[PDB]
Amino acid sequence: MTEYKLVVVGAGGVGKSALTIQLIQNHFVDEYDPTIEDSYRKQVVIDGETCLLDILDTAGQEEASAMRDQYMRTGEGFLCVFAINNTKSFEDIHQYREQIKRVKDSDDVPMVLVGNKCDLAARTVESRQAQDLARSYGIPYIETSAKTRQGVEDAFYTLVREIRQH
Amino acid sequence: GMTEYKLVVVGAGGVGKSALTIQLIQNHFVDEYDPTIEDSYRKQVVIDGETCLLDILDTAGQEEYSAMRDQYMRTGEGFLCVFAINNTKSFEDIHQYREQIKRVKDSDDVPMVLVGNKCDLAARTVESRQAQDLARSYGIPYIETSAKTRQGVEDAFYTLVREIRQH
Amino acid sequence: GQMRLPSADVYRFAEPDSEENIIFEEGIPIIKAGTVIKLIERLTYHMYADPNFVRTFLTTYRSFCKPQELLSLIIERFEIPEPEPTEADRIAIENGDQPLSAELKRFRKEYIQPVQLRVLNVCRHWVEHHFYDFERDAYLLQRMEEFIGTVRGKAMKKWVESITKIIQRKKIANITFQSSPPTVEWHISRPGHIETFDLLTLHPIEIARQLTLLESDLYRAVQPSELVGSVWTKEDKEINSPNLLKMIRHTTNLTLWFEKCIVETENLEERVAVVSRIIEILQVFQELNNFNGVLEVVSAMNSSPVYRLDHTFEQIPSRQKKILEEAHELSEDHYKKYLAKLRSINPPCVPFFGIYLTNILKTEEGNPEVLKRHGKELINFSKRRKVAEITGEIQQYQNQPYCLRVESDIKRFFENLNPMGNSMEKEFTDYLFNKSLEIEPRNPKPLPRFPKKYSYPLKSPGVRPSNPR
Numbered sequence: 029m030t031e032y033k034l035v036v037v038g039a040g041g042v043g044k045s046a047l048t049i050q051l052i053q054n055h056f057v058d059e060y061d062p063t064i065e066d067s068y069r070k071q072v073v074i075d076g077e078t079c080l081l082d083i084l085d086t087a088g089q090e091e092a093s094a095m096r097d098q099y100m101r102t103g104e105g106f107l108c109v110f111a112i113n114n115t116k117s118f119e120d121i122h123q124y125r126e127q128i129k130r131v132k133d134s135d136d137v138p139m140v141l142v143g144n145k146c147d148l149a150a151r152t153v154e155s156r157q158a159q160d161l162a163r164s165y166g167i168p169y170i171e172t173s174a175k176t177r178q179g180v181e182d183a184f185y186t187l188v189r190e191i192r193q194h
Numbered sequence: 195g196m197t198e199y200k201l202v203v204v205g206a207g208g209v210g211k212s213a214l215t216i217q218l219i220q221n222h223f224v225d226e227y228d229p230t231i232e233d234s235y236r237k238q239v240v241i242d243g244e245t246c247l248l249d250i251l252d253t254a255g256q257e258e259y260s261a262m263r264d265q266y267m268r269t270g271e272g273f274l275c276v277f278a279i280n281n282t283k284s285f286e287d288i289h290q291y292r293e294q295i296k297r298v299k300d301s302d303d304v305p306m307v308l309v310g311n312k313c314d315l316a317a318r319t320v321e322s323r324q325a326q327d328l329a330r331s332y333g334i335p336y337i338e339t340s341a342k343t344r345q346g347v348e349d350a351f352y353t354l355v356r357e358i359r360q361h
Numbered sequence: 362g363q364m365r366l367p368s369a370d371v372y373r374f375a376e377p378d379s380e381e382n383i384i385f386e387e388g389i390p391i392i393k394a395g396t397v398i399k400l401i402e403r404l405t406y407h408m409y410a411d412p413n414f415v416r417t418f419l420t421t422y423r424s425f426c427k428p429q430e431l432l433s434l435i436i437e438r439f440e441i442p443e444p445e446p447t448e449a450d451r452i453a454i455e456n457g458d459q460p461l462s463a464e465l466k467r468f469r470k471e472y473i474q475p476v477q478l479r480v481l482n483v484c485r486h487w488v489e490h491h492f493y494d495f496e497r498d499a500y501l502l503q504r505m506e507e508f509i510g511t512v513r514g515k516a517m518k519k520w521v522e523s524i525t526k527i528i529q530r531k532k533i534a535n536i537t538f539q540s541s542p543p544t545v546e547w548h549i550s551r552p553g554h555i556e557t558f559d560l561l562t563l564h565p566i567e568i569a570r571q572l573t574l575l576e577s578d579l580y581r582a583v584q585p586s587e588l589v590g591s592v593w594t595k596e597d598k599e600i601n602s603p604n605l606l607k608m609i610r611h612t613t614n615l616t617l618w619f620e621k622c623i624v625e626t627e628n629l630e631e632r633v634a635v636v637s638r639i640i641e642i643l644q645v646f647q648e649l650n651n652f653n654g655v656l657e658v659v660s661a662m663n664s665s666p667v668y669r670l671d672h673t674f675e676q677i678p679s680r681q682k683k684i685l686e687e688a689h690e691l692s693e694d695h696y697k698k699y700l701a702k703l704r705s706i707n708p709p710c711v712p713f714f715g716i717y718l719t720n721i722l723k724t725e726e727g728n729p730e731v732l733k734r735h736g737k738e739l740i741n742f743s744k745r746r747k748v749a750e751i752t753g754e755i756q757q758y759q760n761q762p763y764c765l766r767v768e769s770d771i772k773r774f775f776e777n778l779n780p781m782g783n784s785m786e787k788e789f790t791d792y793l794f795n796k797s798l799e800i801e802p803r804n805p806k807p808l809p810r811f812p813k814k815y816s817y818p819l820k821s822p823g824v825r826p827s828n829p830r
């Protein structure tokens with residue numbers, strides 16, 4: 029069993045925790061309880077290989093913004109999450125991308141761009157805009173809903189595949 | 195090459211039974227243990243000049259899985275029947291353990307030893323004479339052990355292997 | 362250089378690391394042993410987070426620190442003194458200018474805020490995942506509510522207000538799937554006819570499914586509080602470990618039910634059908650990764666009353682002997698193949714709990730509570746880490762739900778199963794063994810014939826599922 033260290037990052041309230049808990053427990057969290065730092069484990073077979081995912085769920089609130097280096101050092105791959113009804117969260121993505129690159133001293137860190145809350149009709153970030161950004165980063169873009177489960181496995185397991193081939 | 199003996203530890207839960215095998219198999223001189231470690235229950239020993247391998251099954255903690263007792267016992271060639279010297283009920287349970295072992299092995303003559311275990315400083319309630327009398331009534335050896343000082347531990351296991359060899 | 366710290370005389374958590382208060386294992390450090398002060402310092406360290414350590418600590422600390430004392434210590438940790446103005450600040454102030462306060466600002470940003478936030482994370486995890494401390498001690502809960510409810514200052518405000526709400530929620534206290542569950546399967550017994558439910562009349566697929574749902578729920582209900590300190594083995598086990606015991610007693614009852622079904626079927630041909638049906642249920646248990654169920658069956662087939670039934674064994678199809686053999690091999694060599702299989706499958710699954718129990722107990726019994734070093738007694742934390750590794754593995758398999766539909770009547774049937782009736786264990790297991798001797802006597806006694814007891818067809822419908830539109 030190969031162990032994979034995944035880290036979920038992005039602005040406050042975009043659904044990092046809901047995505048993670050949907051993956052781990054098949055449950056949608058309706059409450060908004062801001063995270064400090066949470067970790068989860070999941071045994072799962074991906075492309076016929078059994079592995080063990082360690083998932084770090086991080087704080088998006090700005091008050092925690094000086095405490096990120098320590099978790100970025102440990103992560104092997106990163107889910108960079110924004111919400112498709114929150115343009116500010118999309119604009120915050122590049123800051124996470126740049127910090128990760130700095131801390132890991134690499135232009136080649138496994139990442140997936142995730143556009144969450146795709147169950148909501150009132151979109152403010154268009155898919156094309158996010159896809160263009162993803163291409164500029166050399167990474168896939170996956171739209172998700174923590175509420176309905178759409179895309180959730182695809183997002184996490186695509187990140188595993190990128191770590192695996194790194 | 196060398197003979198392997200499959201030994202099974204049986205007896206009441208909650209009264210320090212696991213100390214027997216831990217103290218034996220342990221790095222005798224460092225009080226430390228990881229039971230998850232493959233072969234933390236296998237030990238090469240020399241008994242009466244003859245080298246052999248002990249494979250010890252101790253399912254301590256699983257006593258409530260009462261319907262699995264037959265399954266576990268069936269694997270054994272010799273048995274340590276353990277009670278705590280400060281717990282009369284555990285001593286009274288011995289008769290039924292022995293009867294169950296005889297049934298599972300389908301034999302009236304199964305290698306076994308009676309072990310009286312001192313697991314703390316609480317008042318002894320089973321005197322050595324009572325236990326000796328019981329063991330004699332069964333035709334098996336009696337060994338007392340300390341769960342703290344390792345006294346008696348080698349004697350309990352070696353005596354059992356001698357019972358197997360002399361069967 | 363490094364930030365200066367408060368004086369160790371006014372803030373205990375600023376004492377320097379030494380071998381007299383903390384020992385590390387041979388990229389964050391792993392603690393072997395330490396004083397409780399040092400454990401709490403590292404639990405809430407300014408340089409890094411350690412979420413695994415938080416779980417390990419909160420799961421196991423009661424073996425070295427009381428809940429009331431833990432709360433006192435983390436409140437003490439939280440209350441960090443700010444440093445005095447520096448020489449450059451002093452000079453600015455004397456000139457009527459605003460000081461830069463560079464050192465103060467750094468200390469707030471890089472020491473106080475991370476440590477305070479990490480104390481709050483301990484509180485959050487404590488309340489969310491270890492709330493039993495507060496259920497059992499109302500005064501402890503009051504103290505936590507009061508502490509959280511009086512934290513001032515905007516840096517922590519979001520989390521303080523959140524933790525307050527989480528506490529209030531916990532005081533007064535839904536699954537989504539990638540697919541639809543398969544259709545419930547029926548055999549001789551039809552929906553609503555609970556009076557006819559039995560081993561051979563329910564569909565073997567649905568027996569395995571409903572037992573798996575039941576056993577999964579029982580497995581998922583067991584909390585670490587029922588395990589730490591080996592409490593399920595001690596005199597107050599019924600108080601401290603009720604969900605664990607309910608789970609084990611279910612397993613025991615099902616095993617005995619299988620044995621009873623077999624030996625109370627005196628007709629050889631009928632008894633062969635009973636055993637074959639049980640091995641089919643085992644096959645579906647295997648397909649569902651219900652290892653508890655697999656071992657329930659294996660335990661029954663290796664029991665004294667059943668094991669000896671050679672005439673019955675002889676008529677079991679070779680393919681079913683192979684299935685039973687493979688299942689039996691899981692347990693061999695101290696569960697070597699089981700452990701490997703568990704670690705290879707795709708959950709959901711139902712582990713066998715017994716191995717965990719033995720490993721927790723032996724870890725507890727085989728390691729000292731303290732290490733003595735330089736005249737000091739240090740808490741042996743590596744022992745606690747080992748126990749929490751086991752509880753962590755247990756919890757990991759508790760997350761994934763089965764995509765199977767409950768059948769309320771079949772569920773009730775198995776919840777109410779009581780093969781021993783009012784009989785004590787010894788009298789009942791003697792009864793089963795005597796039945797075994799009756800239906801297949803010891804050689805050279807002749808094998809008797811017995812009349813059939815079932816009036817319905819014995820042919821199995823098989824264990825491959827059906828699917829109408």
Ligand SMILES: Cc1cc(Cn2c(N3CCNCC3)nc3c(-c4ccccc4Cl)cc(Cl)cc32)cc(C)c1F
Nearest residue numbers: 636659662663667668669670673674677682685686689
């Ligand atoms: C009534 C009855 C009792 C038994 C009890 N028993 C037996 N018997 C062999 C014949 N003499 C008595 C013991 N073999 C097994 C095996 C096994 C191991 C290796 C290879 C093949 C097998 Cl099948 C596994 C298990 Cl868990 C139980 C076994 C088995 C069956 C199938 C029965 F119908």
Ligand SMILES: Nc1nc2c(ncn2[C@@H]2O[C@H](COP(=O)(O)OP(=O)(O)NP(=O)(O)O)[C@@H](O)[C@H]2O)c(=O)[nH]1
Nearest residue numbers: 040041042043044045046058062063088145173174
């Ligand atoms: N409709 C919808 N709501 C969602 C979705 N994901 C999260 N939410 C909601 O958005 C809110 C914030 O979710 P949360 O997971 O706590 O976000 P977060 O990114 O972890 N926040 P933080 O950074 O502070 O820890 C919650 O009310 C949650 O129910 C989604 O996919 N769809």
Ligand SMILES: [Cl-]
Nearest residue numbers: 068069756757
């Ligand atoms: Cl988890």
Ligand SMILES: [Cl-]
Nearest residue numbers: 240241242243
């Ligand atoms: Cl010798």
Ligand SMILES: [Cl-]
Nearest residue numbers: 280281282319
């Ligand atoms: Cl007593």
Ligand SMILES: [Mg+2]
Nearest residue numbers: 044045062063
């Ligand atoms: Mg969150």
